[PDB]
Design a protein around this ligand. Structure first.
Ligand SMILES: O=c1ccn([C@@H]2O[C@H](COP(=O)(O)OP(=O)(O)O)[C@@H](O)[C@H]2O)c(=O)[nH]1
Ligand SMILES: O=c1ccn([C@@H]2O[C@H](COP(=O)(O)OP(=O)(O)O)[C@@H](O)[C@H]2O)c(=O)[nH]1
Ligand SMILES: O=C(O)[C@@H](COP(=O)(O)O)O[C@H]1O[C@H](CO)[C@@H](O)[C@H](O)[C@H]1O
Ligand SMILES: O=C(O)[C@@H](COP(=O)(O)O)O[C@H]1O[C@H](CO)[C@@H](O)[C@H](O)[C@H]1O
Ligand SMILES: [Mn+2]
Ligand SMILES: [Mn+2]
Lengths: 278, 278
């Protein structure tokens, strides 16, 4: 029921660049403390600039390490959250950075690539924009690949429970996807780690499956985090997913006993469609 | 807000056995293919028989390996699901076995110990019945200890979302707990791996927190399973948890792409309170 390129796409960079037909392509890498990996990621994409890709920015989500200077040294334009929308104070979390990035870019197509990937293939951006440029009716392109414990224990079982029409999607929370600016500026942006599951469910409720494609990116690798930082990610994924399914969420943060106690933040506050800022 | 023995309880086996006061104690080990571990588990408890513990059974949930003969060789009474309730056909899953075991035992207090524990401490049963025998108003005693990825990514975040009053419980899905027969035969029994989260939420909705205690069992170890068998456990945990929170569950099983497709069963069918079979 869901368009799925299962094996390596066949289009070439010149074919895809032809099919642009006046549309522009923006690439955004959100970065919070990724000095180790940001340079390899930028370098996998920058060859495409002025060709297929018209714009590449690194949205610096508050990095205190060498992310900014290493990204500058790789030729990337670096935008802080403040610089993307200065009149609006900054909130924490990933969803904030991706929402803000819509103001700092202008491509008709926006591509999101996580800045914590290790040895990312240089055909990621070409593989993601493929269905947008060639397919008709595609507005969102998620990716799948190949670890994935929030996805496989939280997101996918919960979608099976509440939005079973999205059971065919293989990586709902994937950080690598592309979508049209029209779609992105229409949708609200969940906070924190809810942003991906939120844009998936919202796109489906607004356009159905036939506007959603997914593409195989081979196999991936990234930081594999501690189980506790996943508890908080899981919580925010649940919070967002319940909201889009009309289920009230208590707003209570996950408390963990390490034994010593600590409560993690969870946000129920979405950012509005970027359209309202026109 | 929740009674919690944080460190090793102080009662001794003779003190606890005095506080029995005419009540009997039944111990149940549900077993599906546990030949490797069933003997060590039985042996940690059998010294207590005819003393604190009045009855120990192994409810054989369909084992095709040497679980039954090794359990017999360790002096345990072995009951099959058929033998516990012959007039009712057998359904799969853990919840079925624990429900059936209420018919095959008769203690005023029932203690459940997973038969897949490695080197279980012989004070587990004494530590679990402690609050039931000495405390007043305690009807359910959960355990905590010390891995725990369904618990920490699914159960606890979801309880925070939907039943935040149970955020203090440290291991909602723990297989080691004790409860009164009156409570257990009043409650329905979720199917499969939903049985623990179901008995927790149901007990709370019926008696509040002050009927629930939890006790430290130190540190544990068991099989650490594949991520896919956890996906299905997670699904059934979600299914049961949504039901007790009045949220409709689609009944759609989790589909996984290993890429090759496969859908796992999920059950929405609880067993009724064992009382209805009187
Ligand atoms: O407030 C935030 C949180 C995350 N990220 C980015 O989102 C991606 C996914 O974050 P995750 O925490 O899963 O990875 P890690 O922290 O291990 O690098 C990474 O590129 C982060 O730099 C971000 O820009 N802002
Ligand atoms: O249909 C079932 C499923 C599980 N169990 C028991 O429930 C406990 C927890 O099961 P789990 O699958 O988590 O452990 P494992 O299969 O790795 O031994 C174990 O003692 C199993 O023998 C059972 O008796 N019947
Ligand atoms: O699912 C998860 O728990 C992690 C993968 O990290 P693990 O190695 O599973 O701890 O990644 C999630 O978030 C990533 C960033 O947003 C996405 O790229 C993954 O699709 C998603 O699974
Ligand atoms: O939470 C889980 O995923 C597992 C622990 O296994 P893992 O090593 O975390 O894969 O155990 C759950 O189920 C057990 C049996 O019912 C319980 O004893 C645990 O409390 C529960 O966490
Ligand atoms: Mn990552
Ligand atoms: Mn176990």
């Amino acid at each position: 029921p869901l368009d799925t390129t299962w094996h390596r796409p066949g289009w070439t960079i010149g074919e895809l660049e032809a099919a642009k037909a006046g549309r522009t392509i923006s690439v955004v890498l959100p970065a919070l403390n990724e000095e180790a990996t940001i340079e390899s990621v930028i370098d996998s994409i920058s060859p495409l600039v002025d060709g297929l890709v018209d714009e590449l920015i690194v949205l610096d989500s508050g990095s205190t390490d060498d992310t900014e200077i290493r990204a500058i040294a790789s030729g990337a334009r670096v935008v802080s959250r403040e610089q993307a929308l200065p009149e609006v104070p900054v909130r924490p979390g990933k969803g904030e950075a991706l929402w803000r990035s819509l103001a700092a870019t202008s491509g008709d197509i926006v591509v999101f690539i996580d800045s914590d990937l290790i040895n990312p293939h240089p055909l990621f951006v070409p593989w993601l924009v493929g269905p947008l440029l060639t397919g008709e009716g595609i507005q969102l392109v998620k990716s799948f690949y190949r670890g994935g414990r929030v996805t496989e224990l939280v997101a996918r079982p919960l979608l099976a429970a509440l939005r079973p029409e999205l059971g065919c999607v293989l990586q709902p929370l994937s950080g690598e996807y592309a979508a049209s600016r029209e779609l992105l500026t229409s949708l609200p942006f969940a906070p924190g780690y809810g942003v991906e599951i939120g844009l998936l469910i919202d796109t489906f409720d607004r356009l159905g499956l036939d506007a959603i494609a997914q593409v195989n990116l081979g196999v991936r690798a990234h930081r594999n985090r501690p189980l506790d930082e996943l508890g908080a990610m899981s919580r925010q994924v649940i919070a967002t997913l319940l909201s889009r399914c009309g289920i009230p969420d208590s707003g209570v943060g996950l408390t963990q006993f390490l034994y010593t106690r600590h409560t993690w933040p969870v946000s129920l506050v979405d950012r509005p469609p970027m359209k309202v800022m026109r």
